[PDB]
Design a protein around this ligand. Structure first.
Ligand SMILES: [Mg+2]
Ligand SMILES: [Mg+2]
Ligand SMILES: [Mg+2]
Ligand SMILES: [Mg+2]
Ligand SMILES: [Mg+2]
Ligand SMILES: [Mg+2]
Ligand SMILES: [Mg+2]
Ligand SMILES: [Mg+2]
Ligand SMILES: [Mg+2]
Ligand SMILES: [Mg+2]
Ligand SMILES: [Mg+2]
Ligand SMILES: [Mg+2]
Ligand SMILES: [Mg+2]
Ligand SMILES: [Mg+2]
Ligand SMILES: [Mg+2]
Ligand SMILES: [Mg+2]
Ligand SMILES: [Mg+2]
Ligand SMILES: [Mg+2]
Ligand SMILES: [Mg+2]
Ligand SMILES: [Mg+2]
Ligand SMILES: [Mg+2]
Lengths: 60, 70, 141, 145, 55, 143, 67, 63, 206, 80
RNA sequence: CUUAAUUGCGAUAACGAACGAGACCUUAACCUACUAAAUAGUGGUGCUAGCAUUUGCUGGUUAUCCACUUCUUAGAGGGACUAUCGGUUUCAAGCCGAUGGAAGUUUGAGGCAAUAACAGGUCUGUGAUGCCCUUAGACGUUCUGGGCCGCACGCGCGCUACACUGACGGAGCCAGCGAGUCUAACCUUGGCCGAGAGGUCUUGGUAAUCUUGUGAAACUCCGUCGUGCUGGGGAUAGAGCAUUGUAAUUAUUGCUCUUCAACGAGGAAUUCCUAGUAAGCGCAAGUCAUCAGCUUGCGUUGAUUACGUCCCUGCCCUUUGUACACA
């Protein structure tokens, strides 16, 4: 959860009203044992604007 | 600097002759007798315990308790 | 693989996990006998489940507990809970019900919250004070 | 520890290092009223003098005291680490001293003068009876002078 | 210079400490018009035709 | 019946271990003991004054016996308490990385601890030996 | 304070008005009735309505209720 | 000292402009059947027992 | 008492009393009783406990405060004056010493002495500031049993904390002392004087 | 070059996107329309575009030195 | 009448609705039920150490394997509706007690929040902006240095204290919210050297993987000191060593020795608060090259006393008066 705590006022006047925004990050991983034919079929498809897919290999 | 930060041989006798009838004996008890400062008062406690007069019923620092021997 | 259950206990944020396997009556806390739990004035708080329910009842079991989180008091109130919740979880699967319901009866009639986990929890502070209810000082000029 | 039964040997107030030292107080802390020597320094010295810290000041056979003075005014010949001392890299001969109980009053002046006599802004600030370490002088320190 | 700095009499703690405090020190806000805020000062007054034209 | 050190009240164990390293003499203390402070966040040296290297070594020993491995940087943080900063708020401050590194070394040359891999210091197979011994000697006073 | 809003009471009214040959004095079954009989956007709201159709039900059995 | 035990009969309400005072009728346990309404100080519920220091004196509205 | 020994052993003194009478540190929650009428139902002895450290939801309702083991309500009020807020383990230890101190003097089961003191110091009647107009007289009132107990806990604990300040005697000794002198008042305990003078001024306005 | 690609796209029935109708007010009052007319038509077009409700506010100063404001709202809106 | 609420009940020339309150949303609480996880963790087994030996007890082993999901994680669901019973009450909304329950003070804490008003603050956040001013000896801009810290004093927020529920010294030793380095030098384990601050050699980490179990602090334990401005207190100040930075003088910070002030619980006054709350206690984050006695959050230890009223103060509501309506 990415918190950002800030006064609302651009200036300084008034009671000290604070305000905190958050940005929540959800990170999954799914481990697959597959050949090259599916993984490349599955990387082009299932794209989604706003879901960052990352595919790594190498148990090392 | 107010009376009895030392041994004062007569005072040793005082302790041996006065601890009887002490239902409660502790650090604050030994000083209250116009007598030993707290440091050497704390040394008497393990001494009068070396044999007899006092029975250790409390345990630790910041509070001691002894009682007439029976 | 013998008769065995695992149970937990949660005070403020401490959790005390406790596996109850059939054995010859030992009770360890993270590595050590229940006779060394010391902040030590509360020692009879974690003995308490043993004495409410009689010093027997353990000769056929071994209890081990490890507490992560909390603090020098919150952990002590969580182990007793997992110890008693586990002694009553063991009579769930292995001994019969009537023995078990006698145990819930003899704890809850004393119950420093021994089977029931205390819902109290730190309230979130809000801007304007060092506390959650407390406010900063003001002056009116 | 023990119960001791000293004779009339133990003495009340005793004088050394041009000062006065209370007899019925612990010797480590008794040496503290001597200026320039504090809790740490008194401790290490008595340790170095091979003296029983549990003894009061009125104890300490005269040999022990004369030793305790000797080590105080020569810490470097008796292996005291030259960062245990109030005057190192002196300002003129560069040696490592330890100013003691009347000289420390002298060396505060010695120093304060070296600044005034040179017109360093610090000195000027002393001569004006102000704070020199840089603290704000608006709010604090109003009774003093 | 710094020579004049320490040589200067009429300087340093003792001197000031020996001076009475000005009474302007322990004053108030003086507030200078907080209670004529609503009474506009432009002396003009926007008309009503130029308002109805606009809005 | 069998004995671990985890079967012993942590205080009297170390005290019993303290007397041991004392009674023995195979120590390798530095020598600047009685003059060092044991942390910047301290006012006065320890009151043992001949000792407290035994006490810490004994403490140090038990702590490393209790776990996989620790470092000097860990003992700094463990043995460090709160430093009064005069008029300013208290803060935790780490202790001397010299006392500890020399306690680790003086116990390793005495064969109670070894430089574990993965970094750190591991309880010596020979320390297991000697610890559970004096632990069993501690539960001898209570027989 | 636990005075139910109108929408709660209004709904309970409307339900007892037309599904009395159902909705016993048990809330739990009234809950499970509400899902199938009425569209409610949240569990909390539905529980708050069913809990009240229950009350209004339970006192009808002793005497009428106006509304 | 003639001490007087008196069980609280009923809670009547808060007198006193601040409010810390409560009007309550009591029943003595020795020789019951006669009631007295007393002004209490601490927080009181029904069936508590008040030590009336003097028996025959009752109070009313406070300011 | 039919002892039982399992793998990791429970000590005899431990084994002994626990499954026996369910008593205090080593004091008896039994025959201790209130030498007065109400102040019963507002002192807790029976039910019994081992030590006075209980995470009890005693505040979230009005009167349920009166169900706390009174011995523990004695401690709770020790741990205050700011610097000592929190610090119950401190207090919990002060009581055990106090009770043991009080035990030594005048044998008198000490959890009964604590009862006697709380009883013997609660001002039976008191006064408030009724308006009357500008110049406010004082109307006598009869203080409740709960306020009677509560006030006895603060009254005792305070003047004893005030005693143990700036002096060689400890908190437990002064606490023991004030308690002992309050088990049947002796005109020398800081408490009794306040109690007596709260029923002296509640008398002068009647 | 190539690693970025832009594609315009007609927006589906603009009368239900705030941002569109805001920049319409702008491109009316700059083009000189009567403030009440300009805002009132926008509300009318958004409504005929099938909204549950709409609300236009104009704040600032027109031709008069003093600043004013005007709510122009029709239909249904909730706010909490 | 009731409610925290124009919240409802009831009365009723009104009947029946909408905005706002509620609903809703977020977070903290409950799941041995659902889907699993070598970046979370358990039991078994190898392989392995120590003590007892009688089979045990206590550990080691980022894959030697098997299985599980209670503990941790977060998806989907479920759960509470002030439930059941009982007192009180126009026996109305409701309220109070008791049992049960993770939870029954709007469950706790917030987020959102109508119509309206203010000449409230902000042109010094904006390449938002009208007008006015200025525009080359510039009110543009950059560079060098100083200043915002200046010291008879008045006011406000704070920090640390006056000690024995304590300082100090050893020993025990337990959290949670966080952050962390690519075209780069953030978070740093470990090994050495150094009393210390630090230094030096390496290393893990773009992170539930490494720093970190953040072994935090209060706290708990055994000692020393003993009521004395004392070893409480740590201002002022001298002398030395180090780090950040081009730069530390008016001393950024840190460390060492020394110096050892006021302050013996605070007049009139006045602030904050009702349960994991108050107070005590540290920590992370913001700022940040370096500097927190500030702030935003966080967990740890954990009370006393109400559970009331309108007396003081403040504000709402009717009634009522008005020659006010720029009110
Ligand atoms: Mg000195
Ligand atoms: Mg620590
Ligand atoms: Mg420590
Ligand atoms: Mg301090
Ligand atoms: Mg709405
Ligand atoms: Mg699960
Ligand atoms: Mg209940
Ligand atoms: Mg203005
Ligand atoms: Mg602006
Ligand atoms: Mg400024
Ligand atoms: Mg402020
Ligand atoms: Mg100090
Ligand atoms: Mg300490
Ligand atoms: Mg060096
Ligand atoms: Mg790398
Ligand atoms: Mg002093
Ligand atoms: Mg005070
Ligand atoms: Mg910072
Ligand atoms: Mg600031
Ligand atoms: Mg209220
Ligand atoms: Mg009118």
């Amino acid at each position: 959860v990415l918190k950002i705590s800030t006064r609302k006022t651009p200036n300084g006047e008034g009671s000290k009203t604070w305000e905190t925004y958050e940005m929540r990050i959800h990170k999954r991983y799914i481990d697959l044992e597959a050949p090259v034919q599916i993984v490349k079929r599955i990387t082009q498809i299932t794209i989604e604007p706003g879901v960052d897919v990352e595919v790594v290999v190498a148990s090392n | 600097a107010q009376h009895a930060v030392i041994l004062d041989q007569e005072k040793y006798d005082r302790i041996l002759k006065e601890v009887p009838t002490y239902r409660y004996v502790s650090v604050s008890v030994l000083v209250d007798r116009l007598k030993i400062g707290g440091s050497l008062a704390r040394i008497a406690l393990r001494h009068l315990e070396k044999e007899g007069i006092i029975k250790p019923i409390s345990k630790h620092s910041k509070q001691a308790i002894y009682t007439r021997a029976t | 693989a013998v008769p065995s259950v695992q149970t937990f206990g949660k005070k403020k944020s401490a959790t005390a996990v406790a596996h109850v396997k059939a054995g010859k009556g030992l009770i360890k806390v993270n590595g050590s006998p229940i006779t060394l739990v010391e902040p030590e004035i509360l020692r009879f708080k974690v003995y308490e489940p043993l004495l409410l329910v009689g010093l027997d009842k353990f000769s056929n079991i071994d209890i081990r507990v490890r507490v992560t989180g909390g603090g020098h008091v919150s952990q002590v109130y969580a182990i007793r809970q997992a110890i008693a919740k586990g002694l009553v979880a063991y009579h769930q699967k292995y001994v019969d019900e009537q023995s078990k319901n006698e145990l819930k009866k003899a704890f809850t009639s004393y119950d420093r919250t021994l089977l029931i986990a205390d819902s109290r929890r730190p309230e979130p502070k809000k801007f304007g004070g060092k506390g959650a209810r407390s406010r900063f000082q003001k002056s009116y000029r | 520890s023990l119960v001791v039964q000293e004779q009339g040997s133990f003495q009340h107030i005793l004088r050394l290092l041009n000062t006065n030292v209370d007899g019925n107080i612990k010797i480590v802390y008794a040496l503290t009223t001597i200026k320039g020597v504090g809790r740490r320094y008194s401790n290490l010295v008595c340790k170095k003098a091979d003296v029983d810290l549990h003894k009061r000041a009125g104890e300490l056979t005269q040999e022990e005291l004369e030793r305790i003075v000797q080590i105080m005014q020569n810490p470097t010949h008796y292996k005291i680490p030259a960062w245990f001392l109030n005057r190192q890299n002196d300002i003129t001969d560069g040696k490592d001293y330890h100013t003691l109980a009347n000289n420390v009053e002298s060396k505060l002046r010695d120093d304060l003068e070296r600044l005034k006599k040179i017109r360093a802004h610090r000195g000027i600030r002393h001569f004006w009876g102000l704070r020199v370490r840089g603290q704000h002088t608006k709010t604090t320190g109003r009774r003093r002078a | 210079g710094n020579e004049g700095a320490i040589r200067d009499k009429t300087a340093g703690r003792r001197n000031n400490r020996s001076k009475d405090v000005t009474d302007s020190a322990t004053t108030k806000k003086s507030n200078t018009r907080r209670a004529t805020d609503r009474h506009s000062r432009t002396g003009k007054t926007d008309t009503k035709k130029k308002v109805n034209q606009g809005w | 019946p069998g004995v671990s050190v985890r079967d012993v009240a942590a205080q009297d164990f170390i005290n019993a271990y303290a007397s041991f390293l004392q009674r023995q003499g195979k120590l390798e203390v530095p020598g600047y003991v009685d003059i060092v402070k044991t942390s910047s966040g301290n006012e006065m040296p320890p009151q043992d004054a001949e000792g407290w290297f035994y006490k810490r070594a004994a403490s140090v020993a038990r702590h490393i016996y209790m776990r996989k491995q620790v470092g000097v940087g860990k003992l700094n943080k463990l043995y460090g308490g709160a430093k009064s900063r005069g008029v300013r708020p208290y803060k935790h401050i780490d202790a001397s990385g010299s006392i500890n590194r020399k306690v680790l070394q003086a116990l390793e040359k005495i064969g109670i601890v070894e430089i574990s891999p993965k970094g750190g210091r591991r309880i010596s197979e020979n320390g297991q030996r000697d610890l559970d011994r004096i632990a069993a000697q501690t539960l001898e006073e209570d027989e | 304070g636990r005075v139910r809003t109108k929408t709660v009471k209004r709904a309970s009214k409307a339900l007892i008005e037309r599904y009395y040959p159902k909705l016993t004095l048990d809330f739990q079954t009234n809950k499970r009735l509400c899902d199938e009989i009425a569209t409610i956007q949240s569990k909390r709201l539905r529980n708050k309505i069913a809990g009240y159709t229950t009350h209004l039900m339970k006192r009808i059995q002793k005497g009428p209720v106006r509304g | 000292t003639p001490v007087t035990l008196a069980k609280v009969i009923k809670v009547l309400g808060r007198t006193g402009s601040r409010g810390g005072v409560t009007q309550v009728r009591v029943e003595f346990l020795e020789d019951t059947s006669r009631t007295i309404v007393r002004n209490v100080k601490g927080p009181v519920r029904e069936n508590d027992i008040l030590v009336l220091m003097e028996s025959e004196r009752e109070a009313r509205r406070l300011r | 008492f039919t002892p039982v020994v399992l793998a990791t052993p429970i000590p005899e003194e431990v084994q002994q009393a626990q499954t026996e009478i369910k008593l205090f540190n080593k004091w008896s929650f039994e025959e201790v009783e209130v030498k007065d009428a109400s102040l019963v139902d507002y002192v807790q002895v029976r039910q019994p406990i081992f030590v006075a450290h209980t995470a009890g939801r005693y505040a979230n309702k009005r009167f349920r405060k009166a169900q706390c083991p009174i011995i523990e309500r004695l401690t709770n009020s020790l741990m205050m004056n700011g610097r000592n807020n929190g610090k119950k383990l401190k207090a919990v230890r002060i009581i055990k010493h106090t009770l043991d101190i009080i035990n030594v003097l005048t044998d008198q089961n000490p959890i009964q002495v604590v009862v006697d003191a709380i009883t013997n110091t609660g001002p039976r009647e008191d006064t408030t500031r009724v308006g009357g107009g500008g110049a406010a007289r004082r109307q006598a009132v009869d203080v409740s049993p709960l306020r009677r107990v509560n006030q006895a806990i603060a009254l005792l604990t305070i003047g004893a904390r005030e005693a143990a300040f700036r002096n060689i005697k400890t908190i437990a000794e002064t606490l023991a002392e004030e308690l002992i002198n309050a088990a049947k008042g002796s005109s020398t305990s800081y408490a009794i004087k306040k109690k007596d003078e709260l029923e002296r001024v509640a008398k002068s306005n009647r | 070059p190539g690693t970025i690609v832009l594609y315009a796209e007609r927006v589906q029935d603009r009368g239900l996107s705030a941002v569109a109708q805001a920049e319409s007010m702008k491109f009316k009052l700059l083009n000189g329309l009567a403030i009440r007319r300009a805002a009132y038509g926008v509300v009318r077009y958004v409504m005929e575009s099938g909204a549950k409700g709409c609300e236009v506010v104009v704040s600032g100063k027109l031709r008069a030195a003093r600043a004013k404001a005007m709510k122009f709202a029709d239909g249904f809106l909730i706010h909490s």
